[PDB]
Amino acid sequence: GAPPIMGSSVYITVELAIAVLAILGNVLVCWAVWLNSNLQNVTNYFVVSLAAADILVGVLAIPFAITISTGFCAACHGCLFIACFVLVLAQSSIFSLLAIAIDRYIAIAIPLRYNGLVTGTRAAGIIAICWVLSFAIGLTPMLGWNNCGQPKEGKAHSQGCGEGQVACLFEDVVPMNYMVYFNFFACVLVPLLLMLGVYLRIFAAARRQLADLEDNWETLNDNLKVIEKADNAAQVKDALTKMRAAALDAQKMKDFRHGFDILVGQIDDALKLANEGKVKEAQAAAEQLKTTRNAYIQKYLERARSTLQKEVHAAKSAAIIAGLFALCWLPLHIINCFTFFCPDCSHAPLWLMYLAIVLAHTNSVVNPFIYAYRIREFRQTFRKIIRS
Ligand SMILES: Nc1nc(NCCN2CCN(c3ccc(F)cc3F)CC2)nc2nc(-c3ccco3)nn12
Ligand SMILES: CC(C)CCC[C@@H](C)[C@H]1CC[C@H]2[C@@H]3CC=C4C[C@@H](O)CC[C@]4(C)[C@H]3CC[C@]12C
Ligand SMILES: CC(C)CCC[C@@H](C)[C@H]1CC[C@H]2[C@@H]3CC=C4C[C@@H](O)CC[C@]4(C)[C@H]3CC[C@]12C
Ligand SMILES: CC(C)CCC[C@@H](C)[C@H]1CC[C@H]2[C@@H]3CC=C4C[C@@H](O)CC[C@]4(C)[C@H]3CC[C@]12C
Ligand SMILES: CCCCCCCC/C=C/CCCCCCCC(=O)OC[C@@H](O)CO
Ligand SMILES: CCCCCCCC/C=C/CCCCCCCC(=O)OC[C@@H](O)CO
Ligand SMILES: CCCCCCCC/C=C\CCCCCCCC(=O)O
Ligand SMILES: CCCCCCCC/C=C\CCCCCCCC(=O)O
Ligand code: NA
Secondary structure, three states: OOOHHHHHHHHHHHHHHHHHHHHHHHHHHHHHHHHOHHHOOHHHHHHHHHHHHHHHHHHHHHHHHHHHOOOOEEEHHHHHHHHHHHHHHHHHHHHHHHHHHHHHHHHHHOHHHHHHHOOHHHHHHHHHHHHHHHHHHHOHHHHOOOOOOOOOHHHHHHOOOOOOEEEOOHHHHOOHHHHHHHHHHHHHHHHHHHHHHHHHHHHHHHHHHHHHHHHHHHHHHHHHHHHHOOOOHHHHHHHHHHHHHHHHHHHOOHHHHHHHHHHHHHHHHHHHHHHOOOHHHHHHHHHOHHHHHHHHHHHHHHHHHHHHHHHHHHHHHHHHHHHHHHHHHHHHHHHHHHHHHOOOOOOOOHHHHHHHHHHHHHHHHHHHHHHHHHOHHHHHHHHHHHHO
């Protein structure tokens, strides 16, 4: 049995290295949002709240985790706070991640009413409520769902603990049925699955909207061919009626409106000639639509396609952050499931427990890198902060 301080020295050194990187990276995130007005939006307010929780992981949760790894003597309820505060920060991160996904769904599914529905004041109230709810969820053991009524007295005496004290160890004071049923299943797994469903809806909405743009573009070009090779006025009228409904459907900003004003008006001009039985004159009037399509309509199609592809890319970046949260925290949750559900299984070894703990803490480091690599506005703001 090698001296415990040796293995503890590696674990403590790694934890402190994680804490430093978690503080610097996420302070840089908050500093960037504070300085750049282009980064000041509802989505990034939840990013800041997420960054604040990761800052608290380095300032508080990691020192708390180092403290509880020693098994020091402590009053059991004070031990619970040290043990459970990281659950407040993890829960707050989950609420921020869910809000970011929901915010991205509103912007892509109903962009016309997004700005009136999603405001900065309403976001601040949501952030405040989610932090209060995270304290209630994470500190639920302090409300009575704990093992403080059944302390390990033999372990407390062997450590020389005083009266009313226990050896402060995570699995000794925090019930595993809380950790699995309440914290993992209800408060972590279910919101994460809701996040996945929201992201599936986002990408499905983006894919559908892109296909609709290409469908209206095809409908515009197909019916033009129908008009050119029509032999009676009724055929020209049929295609023009479908184009007019498609043109108004694509219309659902001044150069935008003018280009569609010309398009619909030119369709109405040809429709009037078609109803008069003037086939040759209607087809020639419909040929003018090609000038409007090249000069105006195609530019709107490409810009609309460009805006949607940026929303997909922004939603992928946010989904990567949620996926990395799941990847970093799931091993610790899964180990707790083995400890709880399989008492006949040998406990996961010590080195694996602290590997899972370190990995969960590493998640507080990774988000600043995802923003820097995937969001130009952050990366450029990061550069200006560092240079100056
Ligand atoms: N489960 C857990 N533990 C800790 N810290 C204590 C580590 N010791 C756990 C006991 N063990 C052990 C016991 C008997 C053995 F035969 C072998 C062992 F190796 C030593 C090591 N911290 C945590 N945090 C979260 C957590 C936070 C969010 C989700 O889960 N679970 N968790
Ligand atoms: C706002 C920030 C800076 C304040 C940080 C306060 C932290 C460090 C304080 C608040 C409550 C404190 C705990 C309260 C009770 C106990 C029980 C005692 O037997 C050992 C210490 C222990 C476990 C304390 C450790 C430190 C502690 C967690
Ligand atoms: C989310 C992704 C990374 C999957 C994570 C898989 C990890 C967490 C899984 C894969 C294999 C698992 C181990 C397989 C077998 C045992 C032996 C048992 O006596 C205690 C648990 C223990 C030690 C498991 C702990 C959790 C474990 C390490
Ligand atoms: C987010 C994704 C990974 C879904 C989460 C799946 C979790 C809940 C699953 C994956 C593997 C599962 C474990 C696999 C094997 C065992 C051993 C058995 O003796 C008791 C149940 C137990 C311990 C399972 C509990 C639940 C478990 C941890
Ligand atoms: C032991 C005690 C430790 C203290 C833990 C306290 C945890 C609470 C921390 C909360 C940080 C939240 C920061 C989140 C800040 C988000 C920015 C914002 O909301 O502004 C948007 C509006 O201004 C626009 O109108
Ligand atoms: C935009 C800014 C956001 C501001 C965030 C607001 C700060 C949230 C603070 C919440 C405190 C509520 C705590 C309520 C949660 C219950 C747990 C508890 O209080 O246990 C402590 C005692 O049992 C000890 O004996
Ligand atoms: C920027 C502020 C961040 C706070 C830095 C604090 C760093 C201290 C790190 C670890 C504290 C470990 C506490 C040791 C527990 C005592 C061990 C024992 O009593 O047996
Ligand atoms: C851990 C148990 C969770 C607690 C369940 C219920 C606690 C709070 C419930 C809902 C808070 C709703 C927020 C509404 C605040 C008012 C909004 C407004 O002023 O417009
Ligand atoms: Na986090």
